[PDB]
Enzyme design. Sequence first.
Site, mmCIF file in Angstrom:
data_model
loop_
_atom_site.group_PDB
_atom_site.id
_atom_site.type_symbol
_atom_site.label_atom_id
_atom_site.label_comp_id
_atom_site.label_asym_id
_atom_site.label_seq_id
_atom_site.Cartn_x
_atom_site.Cartn_y
_atom_site.Cartn_z
ATOM 1 N N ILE A 10 0.822 -1.204 0.000
ATOM 2 C CA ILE A 10 0.000 0.000 0.000
ATOM 3 C C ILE A 10 0.853 1.249 0.000
ATOM 4 C CG2 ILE A 10 -2.004 -1.099 1.081
ATOM 5 C CD1 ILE A 10 -1.105 0.012 3.757
ATOM 6 N N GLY A 11 2.159 1.118 -0.191
ATOM 7 C CA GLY A 11 3.041 2.288 -0.221
ATOM 8 C C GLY A 11 4.499 1.981 0.091
ATOM 9 N N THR A 14 9.843 5.562 4.319
ATOM 10 C CA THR A 14 11.246 5.926 4.306
ATOM 11 C C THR A 14 12.176 4.820 4.848
ATOM 12 O OG1 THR A 14 11.784 6.914 6.470
ATOM 13 C CG2 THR A 14 10.078 8.020 5.213
ATOM 14 N N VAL A 17 8.826 -1.064 2.779
ATOM 15 C CA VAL A 17 7.502 -1.106 2.170
ATOM 16 C C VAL A 17 6.423 -1.301 3.237
ATOM 17 C CG1 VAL A 17 7.859 -3.535 1.687
ATOM 18 C CG2 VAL A 17 6.020 -2.339 0.570
ATOM 19 N N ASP A 125 11.392 13.971 10.644
ATOM 20 C CA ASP A 125 11.033 13.673 9.241
ATOM 21 C C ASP A 125 9.559 13.938 8.960
ATOM 22 O OD1 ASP A 125 11.653 12.622 6.604
ATOM 23 O OD2 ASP A 125 10.813 10.699 7.145
#
Length: 286
Positions: A10-11, A14, A17, A125
Amino acid sequence: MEKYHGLEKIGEGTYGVVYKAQNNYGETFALKKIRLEKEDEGIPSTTIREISILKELKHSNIVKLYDVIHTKKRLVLVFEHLDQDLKKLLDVCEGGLESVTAKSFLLQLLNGIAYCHDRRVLHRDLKPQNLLINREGELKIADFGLARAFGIPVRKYTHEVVTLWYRAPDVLMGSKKYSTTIDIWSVGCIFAEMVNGAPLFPGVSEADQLMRIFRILGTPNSKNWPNVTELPKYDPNFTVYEPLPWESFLKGLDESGIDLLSKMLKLDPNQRITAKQALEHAYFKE
Protein backbone atom coordinates in the site's frame (compact mmCIF):
# COMPACT_ATOMS: atom_id res chain seq x y z
CA MET A 1 4.87 -14.16 10.80
CA GLU A 2 2.91 -13.70 14.03
CA LYS A 3 0.05 -15.14 12.04
CA TYR A 4 -0.73 -12.30 9.52
CA HIS A 5 -2.13 -12.89 6.04
CA GLY A 6 -3.42 -11.13 2.96
CA LEU A 7 -0.53 -8.68 2.75
CA GLU A 8 -1.06 -6.03 0.10
CA LYS A 9 1.49 -3.40 -0.78
CA ILE A 10 0.00 0.00 0.00
CA GLY A 11 3.04 2.29 -0.22
CA GLU A 12 6.75 2.87 0.38
CA GLY A 13 7.85 4.47 3.61
CA THR A 14 11.25 5.93 4.31
CA TYR A 15 12.36 2.65 6.01
CA GLY A 16 10.78 0.04 3.73
CA VAL A 17 7.50 -1.11 2.17
CA VAL A 18 4.10 -0.87 3.89
CA TYR A 19 1.41 -3.52 3.63
CA LYS A 20 -2.20 -3.80 4.71
CA ALA A 21 -2.81 -7.04 6.51
CA GLN A 22 -5.05 -8.99 8.78
CA ASN A 23 -4.45 -11.15 11.81
CA ASN A 24 -6.62 -14.09 13.04
CA TYR A 25 -9.41 -11.92 14.37
CA GLY A 26 -10.20 -10.41 10.99
CA GLU A 27 -8.84 -7.05 12.28
CA THR A 28 -6.71 -4.95 9.93
CA PHE A 29 -3.21 -3.52 10.47
CA ALA A 30 -0.40 -1.82 8.58
CA LEU A 31 2.86 -3.80 8.45
CA LYS A 32 6.05 -1.85 7.85
CA LYS A 33 9.05 -3.91 6.73
CA ILE A 34 12.09 -2.17 8.11
CA ARG A 35 14.84 -2.01 5.80
CA LEU A 36 17.68 -0.39 7.82
CA GLU A 37 21.06 1.30 7.75
CA LYS A 38 23.19 -1.82 7.68
CA GLU A 39 20.97 -4.77 6.84
CA ASP A 40 23.73 -7.39 6.78
CA GLU A 41 25.01 -6.29 10.22
CA GLY A 42 21.92 -7.63 12.02
CA ILE A 43 19.64 -5.65 14.32
CA PRO A 44 21.22 -4.59 17.60
CA SER A 45 19.26 -5.35 20.77
CA THR A 46 19.21 -1.70 21.81
CA THR A 47 17.30 -0.88 18.59
CA ILE A 48 14.65 -3.49 19.32
CA ARG A 49 14.26 -2.03 22.80
CA GLU A 50 14.12 1.58 21.60
CA ILE A 51 11.37 0.73 19.10
CA SER A 52 9.34 -1.30 21.59
CA ILE A 53 9.10 1.63 23.98
CA LEU A 54 7.35 3.59 21.20
CA LYS A 55 4.44 1.33 22.10
CA GLU A 56 3.75 3.70 25.02
CA LEU A 57 2.82 6.51 22.64
CA LYS A 58 -0.95 6.38 23.01
CA HIS A 59 -2.75 9.46 21.70
CA SER A 60 -5.58 10.10 19.28
CA ASN A 61 -3.28 11.80 16.74
CA ILE A 62 -0.33 9.35 16.81
CA VAL A 63 -0.38 6.10 14.77
CA LYS A 64 -0.43 3.37 17.41
CA LEU A 65 2.34 0.69 17.35
CA TYR A 66 0.99 -2.75 18.36
CA ASP A 67 3.92 -5.11 17.95
CA VAL A 68 7.55 -5.43 17.05
CA ILE A 69 8.33 -8.61 15.14
CA HIS A 70 12.01 -9.55 14.98
CA THR A 71 12.91 -12.60 12.95
CA LYS A 72 16.21 -13.58 11.37
CA LYS A 73 17.27 -10.28 9.83
CA ARG A 74 13.70 -9.23 9.29
CA LEU A 75 12.13 -6.48 11.38
CA VAL A 76 8.41 -5.83 11.03
CA LEU A 77 6.40 -3.16 12.75
CA VAL A 78 2.64 -3.66 13.25
CA PHE A 79 0.75 -0.38 13.23
CA GLU A 80 -2.72 1.00 13.33
CA HIS A 81 -3.97 1.28 9.75
CA LEU A 82 -5.30 4.40 7.96
CA ASP A 83 -6.38 4.55 4.28
CA GLN A 84 -5.24 7.96 3.28
CA ASP A 85 -2.45 10.46 3.80
CA LEU A 86 -2.09 14.24 3.38
CA LYS A 87 0.27 14.04 0.47
CA LYS A 88 -2.19 12.05 -1.62
CA LEU A 89 -4.86 14.58 -0.78
CA LEU A 90 -2.68 17.62 -1.67
CA ASP A 91 -1.71 15.98 -4.91
CA VAL A 92 -5.31 15.82 -6.14
CA CYS A 93 -6.31 19.26 -4.93
CA GLU A 94 -5.92 22.53 -6.73
CA GLY A 95 -5.04 25.52 -4.59
CA GLY A 96 -4.88 23.55 -1.37
CA LEU A 97 -7.36 22.74 1.36
CA GLU A 98 -10.34 24.76 2.53
CA SER A 99 -9.50 26.89 5.53
CA VAL A 100 -11.66 25.02 8.02
CA THR A 101 -10.01 21.73 7.06
CA ALA A 102 -6.52 23.15 7.08
CA LYS A 103 -7.17 24.41 10.62
CA SER A 104 -8.47 21.05 11.86
CA PHE A 105 -5.52 19.20 10.27
CA LEU A 106 -3.15 21.79 11.83
CA LEU A 107 -4.74 21.48 15.28
CA GLN A 108 -4.56 17.67 15.31
CA LEU A 109 -0.95 17.63 14.00
CA LEU A 110 0.06 20.01 16.80
CA ASN A 111 -1.68 17.95 19.47
CA GLY A 112 0.16 14.84 18.35
CA ILE A 113 3.48 16.62 18.23
CA ALA A 114 2.94 18.17 21.65
CA TYR A 115 2.17 14.80 23.32
CA CYS A 116 5.42 13.40 21.87
CA HIS A 117 7.59 16.41 22.59
CA ASP A 118 6.52 16.33 26.24
CA ARG A 119 8.04 12.85 26.35
CA ARG A 120 11.23 13.88 24.49
CA VAL A 121 10.28 11.90 21.42
CA LEU A 122 11.28 13.64 18.16
CA HIS A 123 10.21 12.99 14.58
CA ARG A 124 12.82 14.79 12.44
CA ASP A 125 11.03 13.67 9.24
CA LEU A 126 7.57 15.30 9.26
CA LYS A 127 5.94 15.69 5.91
CA PRO A 128 2.54 15.27 4.25
CA GLN A 129 3.11 11.59 3.51
CA ASN A 130 3.45 10.82 7.25
CA LEU A 131 0.19 12.49 8.16
CA LEU A 132 -2.42 9.79 7.85
CA ILE A 133 -6.15 10.53 7.62
CA ASN A 134 -9.25 8.34 8.10
CA ARG A 135 -12.82 8.67 6.75
CA GLU A 136 -14.00 11.06 9.45
CA GLY A 137 -11.18 13.59 8.89
CA GLU A 138 -9.15 12.43 11.89
CA LEU A 139 -5.41 12.96 11.47
CA LYS A 140 -2.73 10.63 12.83
CA ILE A 141 1.07 11.16 12.58
CA ALA A 142 3.15 8.17 11.56
CA ASP A 143 6.84 7.50 12.34
CA PHE A 144 7.47 9.53 15.45
CA GLY A 145 10.56 8.19 17.14
CA LEU A 146 11.84 5.99 14.35
CA ALA A 147 14.62 8.45 13.38
CA ARG A 148 16.24 8.13 16.79
CA ALA A 149 16.02 4.35 16.70
CA PHE A 150 16.97 3.79 13.04
CA GLY A 151 18.92 6.91 12.17
CA ILE A 152 18.01 9.06 9.17
CA PRO A 153 19.15 7.51 5.93
CA VAL A 154 19.78 9.09 2.56
CA ARG A 155 16.63 8.01 0.71
CA LYS A 156 16.02 7.13 -2.96
CA TYR A 157 16.45 10.28 -5.09
CA THR A 158 12.81 11.20 -5.39
CA HIS A 159 12.27 10.75 -1.66
CA GLU A 160 15.30 12.64 -0.40
CA VAL A 161 14.14 15.56 -2.59
CA VAL A 162 10.64 15.77 -1.05
CA THR A 163 12.32 15.47 2.36
CA LEU A 164 14.44 18.63 1.83
CA TRP A 165 11.28 20.67 1.40
CA TYR A 166 10.55 20.35 5.13
CA ARG A 167 14.03 20.56 6.57
CA ALA A 168 14.97 23.46 8.79
CA PRO A 169 17.77 25.83 7.76
CA ASP A 170 19.94 24.96 10.75
CA VAL A 171 19.77 21.30 9.82
CA LEU A 172 20.64 22.02 6.17
CA MET A 173 23.61 24.00 7.55
CA GLY A 174 25.04 21.00 9.44
CA SER A 175 23.48 21.05 12.90
CA LYS A 176 23.15 17.67 14.63
CA LYS A 177 21.60 18.80 17.91
CA TYR A 178 18.58 17.11 19.52
CA SER A 179 15.73 19.58 19.21
CA THR A 180 12.00 19.88 19.13
CA THR A 181 12.43 22.95 16.94
CA ILE A 182 13.17 20.84 13.89
CA ASP A 183 9.67 19.44 13.92
CA ILE A 184 8.01 22.86 14.30
CA TRP A 185 9.71 24.15 11.12
CA SER A 186 8.24 21.14 9.27
CA VAL A 187 4.77 22.05 10.60
CA GLY A 188 5.21 25.55 9.20
CA CYS A 189 6.07 24.21 5.81
CA ILE A 190 3.12 21.84 5.99
CA PHE A 191 0.86 24.75 7.07
CA ALA A 192 1.95 26.86 4.11
CA GLU A 193 1.46 23.95 1.77
CA MET A 194 -2.16 23.34 2.93
CA VAL A 195 -2.95 27.02 2.26
CA ASN A 196 -1.16 27.30 -1.12
CA GLY A 197 -1.53 23.91 -2.71
CA ALA A 198 2.21 23.60 -3.37
CA PRO A 199 5.28 23.17 -1.24
CA LEU A 200 6.58 26.52 0.00
CA PHE A 201 10.27 25.70 -0.59
CA PRO A 202 10.76 23.08 -3.33
CA GLY A 203 14.56 22.76 -3.54
CA VAL A 204 16.46 20.05 -5.41
CA SER A 205 19.54 19.97 -3.17
CA GLU A 206 20.55 21.13 0.25
CA ALA A 207 22.18 24.29 -1.03
CA ASP A 208 19.31 25.02 -3.37
CA GLN A 209 16.92 24.37 -0.46
CA LEU A 210 18.67 26.91 1.76
CA MET A 211 18.55 29.55 -0.97
CA ARG A 212 14.89 28.98 -1.71
CA ILE A 213 14.28 29.55 1.99
CA PHE A 214 16.32 32.74 2.25
CA ARG A 215 14.82 34.12 -0.95
CA ILE A 216 11.42 34.17 0.72
CA LEU A 217 12.15 34.69 4.43
CA GLY A 218 15.33 36.72 4.16
CA THR A 219 18.99 35.76 4.65
CA PRO A 220 20.22 35.31 8.25
CA ASN A 221 22.04 38.05 10.11
CA SER A 222 23.15 39.23 13.59
CA LYS A 223 19.68 40.50 14.54
CA ASN A 224 17.49 37.72 13.14
CA TRP A 225 19.84 34.83 13.99
CA PRO A 226 22.69 35.37 16.46
CA ASN A 227 25.14 32.51 16.48
CA VAL A 228 24.01 31.26 13.08
CA THR A 229 27.77 31.66 12.45
CA GLU A 230 28.48 28.65 14.64
CA LEU A 231 26.88 26.28 12.13
CA PRO A 232 29.35 24.17 10.14
CA LYS A 233 28.02 24.99 6.65
CA TYR A 234 27.21 28.63 7.37
CA ASP A 235 28.82 31.15 4.98
CA PRO A 236 29.04 34.85 5.67
CA ASN A 237 29.15 35.25 1.89
CA PHE A 238 25.45 34.32 1.44
CA THR A 239 23.83 36.59 -1.15
CA VAL A 240 21.66 38.88 0.91
CA TYR A 241 17.87 38.76 0.55
CA GLU A 242 15.24 40.83 2.32
CA PRO A 243 12.12 39.06 3.62
CA LEU A 244 9.00 39.07 1.50
CA PRO A 245 5.72 40.32 2.92
CA TRP A 246 3.84 37.36 4.45
CA GLU A 247 0.73 38.19 2.38
CA SER A 248 2.66 37.92 -0.87
CA PHE A 249 3.32 34.16 -0.50
CA LEU A 250 0.39 33.13 1.75
CA LYS A 251 -2.78 33.26 -0.39
CA GLY A 252 -5.46 35.00 1.62
CA LEU A 253 -4.66 32.88 4.68
CA ASP A 254 -6.13 35.17 7.44
CA GLU A 255 -4.56 37.54 10.01
CA SER A 256 -4.23 35.06 12.87
CA GLY A 257 -3.15 32.30 10.45
CA ILE A 258 -0.30 34.37 9.03
CA ASP A 259 0.82 35.33 12.53
CA LEU A 260 0.91 31.73 13.76
CA LEU A 261 2.70 30.65 10.61
CA SER A 262 5.24 33.47 11.01
CA LYS A 263 6.07 32.06 14.46
CA MET A 264 6.77 28.61 13.03
CA LEU A 265 9.06 29.73 10.24
CA LYS A 266 11.38 31.86 12.41
CA LEU A 267 14.90 31.03 11.19
CA ASP A 268 16.37 31.09 14.66
CA PRO A 269 15.40 27.73 16.29
CA ASN A 270 15.44 29.37 19.69
CA GLN A 271 12.75 31.87 18.75
CA ARG A 272 10.50 29.36 17.08
CA ILE A 273 7.10 28.79 18.66
CA THR A 274 6.59 25.44 20.43
CA ALA A 275 3.76 23.03 19.69
CA LYS A 276 1.95 23.77 22.92
CA GLN A 277 2.36 27.58 22.44
CA ALA A 278 0.99 27.19 18.95
CA LEU A 279 -2.07 25.44 20.37
CA GLU A 280 -2.75 28.55 22.44
CA HIS A 281 -2.85 30.86 19.45
CA ALA A 282 -5.92 32.95 18.63
CA TYR A 283 -6.01 31.12 15.29
CA PHE A 284 -7.59 28.05 16.91
CA LYS A 285 -10.06 30.07 19.00
CA GLU A 286 -11.50 31.69 15.87
